């Protein structure tokens, strides 16, 4: 399928904090409600909380500033799910970089 | 509770109707809470056997099952509040095929 382009987001940010970084939606969701949830190393896996996505618009923030010579990348994989349940897509990977 | 493990669920093969509801997974906290669980059965293959309702947390079986094939599973329930935030640790759940 379409392959996401990778963030790009540079170390030592400033914020201010939740610092909005794209939104990654369905265009199914105006016609059918759906919940959107993020996993991975960086979300649910350590290290956990770093970055989030809200559950109605699919608006994805860093929580924290970023350090690449600790870790330069980060896998997660977005979902979409129905007001029962039921994942209405396949889960998509979203990459992000830090850099400097 | 604050690492209190839940017992696991069995569930006999050769089940319906279906969606067939099993149990009801849930933070006492629910402040609006959305509930979502991951792994083997879930989100990752076998895909949507089980599934979790966003707001009340009950967890259903889509389809029959065969202990044969899959003995058993072993997800984790998720809790975020409105805008994303996780509230709660992670809960295993194991689901035995009996
Ligand atoms: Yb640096
Ligand atoms: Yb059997």
Same mark, same amino acid.
């Given at each position: 399928?379409?392959? $996401? @382009? ?34 991975? @190393? ?7 909380? $770093? ?13 924290? @500033? ?32 830090? $850099?400097?």
């Amino acid at each position: 399928d379409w392959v $996401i @382009p990778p963030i790009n987001l540079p170390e030592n940010s400033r914020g201010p904090f939740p610092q909005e970084l794209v939104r990654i939606r369905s265009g199914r969701d105006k016609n059918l409600s759906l919940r959107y949830s993020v996993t991975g @190393p960086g979300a649910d896996q350590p290290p956990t909380g $770093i970055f989030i996505i809200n559950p109605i618009s699919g608006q994805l923030s860093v929580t924290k @500033p970023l350090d690449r010579e600790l870790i330069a990348r980060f896998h997660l994989r977005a979902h979409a799910v129905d007001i029962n349940g039921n994942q209405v897509e396949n889960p998509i990977d979203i990459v992000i970089n830090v $850099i400097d």
